[PDB]
């Protein structure tokens, strides 16, 4: 048979609704898990990241924006200026959404 | 300090045992290892540091501590530093420490 | 300190040298002889970067 | 993840209360009626 | 009327130099420097004789804090500028403006925070579950006061020594009206 | 790609 | 990567003196000496991390502090240093500390 | 929170946070902004009464006592103790939650109900050290924190209160 | 009928779809993120309290039929269920079946799932254990 609680109703309900006690469970704490990690970077001079980008492009010729932020570890604001100055984004080609070196320097 | 002497012996032994592979790559003779060991040991004993088995701007004899810091904080006049795995030289005497606490007041 | 900080013009890759040369050229009102370019980058002899620029 | 918001007790509570207060046996008619207290036999 | 003049604890001042600085060079060639780009985008330095802290940015802007007087703040800013000049960067004293004045005092008696919050509800904001002090936003002069049960008053927001004194003089009567027991 | 979130019975 | 600060210690200074003397003698290559220093950093880091248990504390007054490139630098004047027992009085102790978390 | 206060059923910051995941700084800033907006619209276009006050520790005591399962007599005694607790300057500055919890604990030990501070603080999410510390301050004025009618009738006297 | 329902059918109903499992696959984007997780929520036993009412201020107390009738309150009791929250994870090597393993995170508490109206003179009602004198005291007609 079902089990009936003989304790005081208020005591049994103390854990329900807006309760003072804060939950100590760690289940489905995806927000905590991914929010705890956070790292930023400085604007190193363009003259170095530029050669770094050339070697990275030599490694691979079609490289995404998220991967670029991860690998170079630079802010998007600064990264975009040099990336547009040296490379261009192919929007209609099969490798869409991927920044690639402009043909002017690629064809060398 | 017996611990300092033991650690120094370990360091020298590890260095000489590990550099052999690179030395053979360079094609240098075996006796060079003995010469390096001898000269290094003579320098250590010459320093006489410990007993051995053998303005607003920035401008041996000077006491110096070289280590790593785990966490450093301050409260408005006081600095607390937690250091680990370091070596210190004070008044020509060398000591080694796994952990250390620095509690100073910045006047 | 700034003299030490200034980086040698010998960049890792020739494309960087070419890009800097192109920018320096574009920021001039009138054409600049090869002498100005040589004063810019310390490559007096015939350089592959210069050839690529041509 | 908050369990207090994951599980809403009002679902069960309001569903049962509605189905019993009204005769609409959902979320058939006349399943529940006000008890007659006019007399004991009634 | 009160007979007590609140004492200025803190002074926040801002100065400009009009020249670009090299934070790396300043950190390497400065006695007390803290250059942590991951932490902040400026160099933190401190000086002892005025006992003041300055935040120096790469744009030539300096923020001095900790001074206990206007002339002391002026002296500290001048010494900071002289230190940078000795480092070598072209730094010239320019507009020096005190952007904040903080003062403290005590009325020497308990104050009914609930009474103040109820009577003056257009300026006070009392939430004892977060901070144990009532917050009074005086409109003229535009200043913020922190009133505590222990009878201690903290004034912050004044730009000159006159405004803080005026605010204390204007707040003393309403504080005295609500004395416990 | 999948929906990265699915119910298994 | 491992820090090179250990070259400033007594053992590091003696090693540098020996290697440079041999270089002057011409019996060792300079690049080989650089390799020796690189391996010295590794061995010193490992042995100091794994083969020590002593703890010492220093209390005094700071005379100058600084932080740059994840390298703290303190100068404590008129300090007392205790190891495990016996206190040592130091007029001026310079401390240079690198980040505990090795930068890859 | 504003609605709960306006309905005379005011809840606490922690209680609302237990459901809504918002940090204290943002919650307080938004609450102040909303109160200012309500005041501005009440003037230009009532809204607030004695209930709008912040502390209002009396309203919390019945619910905490219900959570602990204490009888209504103990609840009323705790309400009286909390009401008279504001006369002590050493305690009036404390948080209303702490004031109510300490009063409830004092009445619990007055009536010798077998509930320890370790469980009182666990149920009401308050540090046991804080509870006992507040009890220390209130013990020096226990005489003014007990109902004269209760002590005269003799349900319990001042004696049943251990002091450290 | 009501006693049978409350005694057995509630547990039987909850023991049909007790387990709800959501699987987050590898989502291969980089070699540093190749673990696949599985979150499971399971329902165990069910507990039922005595008839209770919570007031506006948040105070809860036992409710009797007379007070319910007078105050227009629903004569009902709360239902509680034990919930187990498990989470498994596995290394999703490409082109192979997974082996889900517990990650030492198995939380386990009673969760309120609503109020069940209680038929009078039932096993879960207050008047089933009341004698004639008790009914007279409680203002109920024997």
Length of chain H: 164
Q: Is A42 on the interface with E (CB under 8 A)?
A: yes
* Dist. CA B36–CA G22, nearest whole Å: 9
**Contact by Cβ (8 Å): E42, E58:** yes
Cβ–Cβ of E24/G68 closer than 8 Å?
yes
E45 contacts E56 by C-beta, under 8 angstroms: yes
The number of angstroms, rounded, from the C-alpha of E125 to the middle of its chain's C-alpha atoms is: 21
Residue ending a domain, choose from E83, E98, E113: E98
How many whole angstroms separate alpha carbon E122 and alpha carbon A33?
A: 43
* Shortest alpha-carbon distance between residue I20 and chain F (Å): 7
Whether residue G4 is found in the same domain as residue G45:
yes
- Interchain proximity E31–B107, CB inside 8 Å: no
Residues G40 and G71 in one domain: no
Nearest CA in chain G to B18: G39
DSSP labels, H34-90:
HHHHHHHHHHH-----GGGSS--GGGHHHHHHHHHT--HHHHHHHHHHHHHHTT-HH
- C contact set with A (CB within 8 A): 7, 11-13, 15-16, 18-20, 52
Is residue G3 located within the same domain as residue G35? yes
Alpha-carbon distance of A15 to A8, in angstroms, equals 13
Q: What CA–CA distance (Å, rounded) separates B106 from E48?
A: 9
Asked if F touches A (at least 3 Cβ pairs < 8 angstroms), the answer reads no
Our answer on whether I and F touch (3+ beta-carbon pairs < 8 Å) is yes
Q: Are the C-beta atoms of E61 and E16 separated by less than 8 Å?
A: yes
Nearest to residue H150, comparing CAs of H103, H110, H96, H117?
H110
User: Of H109, H49, H112, H106, which Cα lies nearest the Cα of H83?
Assistant: H106
The Cα C44–Cα H100 span in angstroms is 86
Q: Do chains H and C touch (3 or more CB pairs under 8 A)?
A: no
Task: Pick the residue from chain C with its C-alpha nearest to E26.
Answer: C1
Two structure tokens written together for A17: 């609704």
Angle ∠(H41,H43,H46) on CA atoms, nearest 5: 85
Kindly give, in sequence order, each residue whose CB lies less than 8 Å from that of residue A90, ignoring residues fewer than 6 positions away.
A96, A98, A100
Task: Count F/I contacts: CB-CB distance under 8 Å.
Answer: 15
Kindly identify which residue of chain B lies nearest to residue G64, measuring between CA atoms: B106
d(CA E120, CA E139) in angstroms, rounded, equals 13
Query: What's chain G look like in SS3?
Result: CCCCHHHHCHHHHHHHHHHHHHHHHCCCCHHHHHHHHHHHHHHHHHHHHHCCCCEEEEEEEEEEEEEECCEEEEEEEEEEEEECCEEEEEEEEEEEEEECCCCC
- Return d(Cα B36, Cα B17) in angstroms, integer: 12
Best E31, E46, E52 residue to mutate vs chain B (most B CBs within 10 Å):
E31
The residues on D that touch H, with CB distances below 8 Å, are 2, 4-5
The answer to whether residue H89 neighbours chain E at the CB level (below 8 Å) is yes
Q: By the 8 A CB rule, do B27 and B35 touch?
A: no
Instruction: Give the DSSP H or E segment for E10.
Output: strand E7-16
CA distance G99 to H28: 38
Are residues E174 and E160 in contact, defined by beta-carbon separation less than 8 angstroms?
Answer: no
- Whether H15 and A18 lie within 8 Å, measured CB to CB: yes
E79 and E128 together in one domain: no
CB nearest to I22's CB, from F1, F2, F5? F5
Contact D11 I114 (CB under 8 A): yes
| Superfamily (CATH H level) for H57-153 | Cyclin-like (1.10.472.10)
**Contacts of residue A42, Cβ cutoff 8 Å, sequence gap at least 6:** E37, E38
How close H134 gets to chain D, by Cα (Å)?
A: 32
Distance from CA of A39 to the nearest CA of H (A): 22
Do E94 and E106 belong to one domain?
no
Return the bridge partners of E106, or none. Answer: E152
Q: What is the CA radius of gyration of chain E?
A: 20
Is residue B104 within 8 A of residue G76, CB to CB? The reply is yes
- Cα–Cα distance between G97 and A56 in angstroms, integer? 34
CB contact under 8 A, D2 and A30: no
How far is the C-alpha of E146 from the C-alpha of E136, rounded, in Å? Answer: 6
The alpha carbons of chain G give a radius of gyration, in whole angstroms, of 17
CA-CA distance, G94 to B80, in Å (whole number)? Answer: 15
Residues sharing a CB contact under 8 Å with residue E103, sequence separation 6 or more, in sequence order: E6, E7, E8, E9, E154, E155, E156, E158, E164, E168
The reply to whether residue H21 touches residue D4, judged by beta carbons under 8 angstroms, is no
Q: Are E179 and E109 in contact (CB under 8 A)?
A: yes
First vs last C-alpha separation in chain E: 22
Sign of CA dihedral C8, C12, C14, C15: negative
DSSP letter assigned to residue I111: E
Q: Which of E127, E131, E178 to mutate against chain H (most H CBs within 10 Å)?
A: E127
Q: Is I114 left (phi over 0), alpha (psi -120 to 50) or beta?
A: left
Domain count, chain G: 2
Give Cα separations from A32 to A26, A27, A35, A37, A38 (angstroms): 9, 10, 5, 9, 12
- Provide, as residue numbers in chain A, all residues whose Cβ is less than 8 Å from the Cβ of E38: 39-40, 42
Q: Rounded distance, CA E151 to CA E88, Å?
A: 50
- 3-state DSSP call for residue B79? strand
Residue in the block written with tokens 């006693």: I3
Could you tell me where the DSSP H helices lie in E33-160? 70-87, 113-119
Cβ atoms of residues I49 and I63 within 8 Å:
no
DSSP state letter for I138: T
Indicate the helix (H) or strand (E) that contains I70. Answer: helix I65-71
Chains in contact with D, counting 3 or more C-beta pairs less than 8 Å apart as contact: A, H, I
Out of H8, H11, H66, whose CB is closest to I59? H66
Q: Both G64 and G88 in a single domain?
A: yes
Same domain, G48 and G58: no
- Inspect the structure and tell me whether chains I and E have 3 or more CB pairs less than 8 Å apart: no
Instruction: Return residues 62-91 of A near E (CB < 8 Å).
Output: none
Using alpha carbons, list the distances in angstroms from residue B78 to G60, G81, I136: 10, 17, 76
Do G59 and G95 sit in the same domain of this protein?
yes
A101 in Cβ contact with A87 (< 8 Å): yes
Collect all residues with Cβ–Cβ distance below 8 Å to G24 and sequence separation of at least 6: none
Q: Which helix (H) or strand (E) holds E33?
A: strand E33-35
Which residues of I fall below an 8 Å CB-CB distance to F?
20-25, 27
d(CA I125, CA I91): 53
Same domain, G71 and G29: no
Using alpha carbons, select from E71, C28, D7 the residue that is nearest to residue I78: D7
I11: nearest CA in chain A?
A2
DSSP string, C1-54: -HHHHSPPS--SSHHHHHHHHHHHHHT-SS---HHHHHHHSS--S--HHHHHH-
Report which of E35, E48, E30, E45 is spatially closest to residue E88, judged by C-alpha positions: E30
Whether E93 and E129 share a structural domain: no
- As given in the structure block, the two tokens for residue I78 are 């709360």
**Alpha-carbon I116 to chain mean position:** 11
The tally of domains found in chain E comes to 2
Chain E residue with the nearest C-alpha to that of A44:
E37
Task: Kindly list the partner chains of chain B, i.e. chains with 3 or more CB atom pairs below 8 Å.
Answer: E, G
Distance (Å) of CA A107 to CA A96, A102, A103, I42: 20, 8, 5, 61
Place of tokens 């109206």: I117
Class of residue G19 by CB neighbours under 10 A (exposed 0-12, middle 13-18, buried 19+): buried
- The C-alpha angle G79, G84, G87, rounded to 5 degrees, equals 35
Question: G58 and G31, same structural domain?
Answer: no
Contact: G83, B95; criterion CB under 8 Å: yes
Domain range spanning residue E35?
13-98
Q: What residues make up the domain containing G95? A: 54-100
G92 vs G32: CA distance, rounded Å:
37
Instruction: Match domain B2-47 to its CATH number in 3.30.70.260, 3.30.70.330, 3.90.550.40, 1.10.287.100.
Output: 1.10.287.100
Single out the residue in E41, E71, E98 at which a domain terminates: E98
Which resolution in angstroms does this entry have?
A: 3.2
Count of all residues that appear for chain F in the document: 9
How far apart CA I111 and CA I80 sit, in angstroms, is 5
DSSP single-letter state for residue A82:
H
- Does any CB of chain A come closer than 8 Å to the CB of residue E38? yes
Query: Do G79 and G49 belong to one domain?
Result: no
Please indicate, yes or no, whether residues G66 and G85 belong to a single structural domain of this protein. Answer: yes
Q: How many CB atoms lie within 10 A of CB E10?
A: 14
* Alpha carbon separation from B82 to G60, G72, G87, I106 (Å, rounded): 15, 12, 19, 36
Domain final residue, candidates E39, E66, E98 = E98
What φ, ψ does residue E62 adopt, rounded to 5°? -125, 140
Read off the tokens for H106. 């004092």
CB contact under 8 A, A2 and I109: no
Exposure string (b/e) for E57-70, b if CB count within 10 Å is 16 or more?
beebebbbbbbeeb
Considering the domain architecture, whether residues E41 and E74 belong to the same structural domain is answered as yes
Put residue G101 in one of left, alpha, beta given phi > 0 → left and psi -120 to 50 → alpha: beta
């Amino acid at each position: 048979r079902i089990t009936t609680l003989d304790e005081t109703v208020g005591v049994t309900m103390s854990h329900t609704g807006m309760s003072m006690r804060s939950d100590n469970s760690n289940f489905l704490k995806v927000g905590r898990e991914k929010a705890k990690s956070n790292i930023k970077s400085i604007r190193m001079p363009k003259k170095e990241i530029l050669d770094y980008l050339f070697k990275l492009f030599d490694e691979y010729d079609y490289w995404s924006l998220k991967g670029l932020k991860e690998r170079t570890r630079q802010p998007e604001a600064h990264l975009k200026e040099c990336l547009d100055k040296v490379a261009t984004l192919v929007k209609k080609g099969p490798y869409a959404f991927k920044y690639t070196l402009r043909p002017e320097y690629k064809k060398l | 300090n017996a611990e300092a002497s033991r650690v120094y012996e370990i360091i020298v032994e590890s260095v000489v045992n590990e550099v052999r592979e690179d030395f053979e790559n360079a094609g240098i003779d075996e006796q060079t290892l003995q010469d390096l060991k001898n000269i290094w040991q003579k320098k250590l004993t010459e320093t006489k540091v410990t007993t051995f088995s053998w303005d607003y701007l920035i401008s041996p004899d000077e006491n110096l501590m070289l280590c790593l810091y785990d966490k450093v904080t301050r409260t408005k006049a006081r600095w607390k530093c937690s250091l680990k795995d370091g070596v210190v030289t004070i008044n020509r005497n060398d000591y080694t420490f796994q952990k250390a606490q620095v509690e100073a007041e910045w006047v | 300190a700034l003299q030490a900080n200034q980086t040698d013009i010998s960049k890792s890759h020739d494309s960087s040298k070419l890009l800097w040369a192109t920018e320096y050229i574009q920021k001039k009102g009138k054409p600049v002889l090869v002498n100005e370019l040589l004063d810019y980058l310390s490559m007096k002899k015939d350089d592959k970067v210069i050839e690529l620029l041509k | 993840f908050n369990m207090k918001l994951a599980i809403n007790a009002k679902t069960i509570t309001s569903g049962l209360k509605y189905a019993l207060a009204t005769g609409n046996w959902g979320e058939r008619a006349g399943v529940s009626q006000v008890l007659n207290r006019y007399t004991y036999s009634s | 009327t009160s007979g007590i003049v609140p004492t200025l604890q803190n002074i926040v001042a801002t100065v400009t130099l009009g020249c670009r600085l090299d934070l790396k060079t300043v950190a390497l060639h400065a006695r007390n420097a803290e250059y942590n780009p991951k932490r902040f985008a400026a160099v933190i330095m401190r000086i002892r004789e005025p006992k003041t802290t300055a935040l120096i940015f790469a744009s030539g802007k300096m923020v001095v804090t900790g001074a206990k007087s206007e002339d002391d703040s002026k002296l500290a800013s001048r010494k900071y500028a002289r230190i940078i000049q000795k480092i070598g960067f072209a730094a010239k004293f320019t507009d020096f403006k005190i952007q904040n004045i903080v003062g403290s005092c005590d009325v020497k008696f308990p104050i009914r925070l609930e009474g103040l919050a109820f009577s003056h509800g257009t300026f006070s904001s009392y939430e004892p579950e977060l901070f144990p002090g009532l917050i009074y936003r005086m409109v003229k002069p535009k200043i913020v006061l922190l009133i505590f049960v222990s009878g201690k008053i903290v004034l912050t927001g004044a730009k000159q020594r006159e405004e803080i004194y005026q605010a204390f003089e204007a707040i003393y009567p309403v504080l005295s009206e609500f004395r416990k027991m | 790609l999948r929906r990265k979130t699915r119910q298994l019975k | 990567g491992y820090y090179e600060l250990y070259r400033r210690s007594t053992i590091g200074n003696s090693l540098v003196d020996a290697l440079d003397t041999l270089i002057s003698d011409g019996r060792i290559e300079a690049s080989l000496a650089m390799r020796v220093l690189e391996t010295f950093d590794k061995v010193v880091a490992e042995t100091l991390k794994d083969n020590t248990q002593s703890k010492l504390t220093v209390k005094g007054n700071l005379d100058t502090y600084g932080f740059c490139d994840d390298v703290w630098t303190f100068i404590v004047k008129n300090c007392q240093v205790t190891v495990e027992q016996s206190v040592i009085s130091v007029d001026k102790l310079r401390i240079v500390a690198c980040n505990s978390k090795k930068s890859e | 929170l504003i609605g709960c206060r306006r309905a005379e059923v005011a809840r606490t910051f922690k209680e609302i946070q237990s459901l809504i995941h918002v940090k204290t700084k943002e919650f307080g800033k938004t609450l102040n902004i909303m109160k200012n907006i309500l005041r501005g619209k009440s003037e230009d276009g009532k809204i607030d009464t004695d209930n709008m006050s912040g502390a209002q520790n009396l309203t919390y005591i019945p619910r905490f006592c219900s959570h602990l399962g204490l009888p209504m007599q103990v609840t009323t005694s705790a309400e009286y103790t909390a009401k008279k607790c504001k006369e002590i300057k050493e305690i009036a500055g404390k948080s209303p939650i702490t004031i109510a919890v300490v009063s409830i604990y004092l009445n619990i030990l007055l009536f010798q109900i077998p509930i320890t501070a370790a469980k009182v603080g666990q149920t009401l999410q308050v540090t046991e050290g804080t509870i006992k510390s507040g009890y220390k301050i209130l013990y020096e004025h226990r005489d003014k924190l007990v109902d004269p009618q209760l002590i005269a009738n003799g349900v319990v006297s001042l004696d049943n209160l251990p002091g450290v | 009928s009501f006693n049978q329902f409350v005694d057995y059918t509630l547990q039987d109903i909850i023991c049909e779809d007790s387990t709800l499992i959501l699987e987050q696959l590898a989502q291969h984007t980089t070699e540093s993120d190749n673990i696949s997780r599985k979150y499971e929520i399971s329902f165990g036993k069910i507990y039922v309290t005595k008839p209770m009412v919570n007031e506006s201020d948040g105070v809860t107390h036992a409710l009797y039929p007379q007070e319910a009738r007078l105050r227009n309150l629903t004569y009902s009791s709360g239902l509680f269920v034990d919930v187990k929250k498990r989470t498994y994870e596995a290394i999703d090597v490409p082109g192979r079946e997974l082996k889900y393993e517990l990650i030492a995170e198995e939380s386990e508490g009673k969760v309120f799932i609503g109020r069940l109206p209680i038929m009078l003179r039932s096993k879960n009602c207050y008047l089933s254990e009341a004698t004639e004198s008790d009914l007279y005291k409680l203002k109920e007609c024997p």
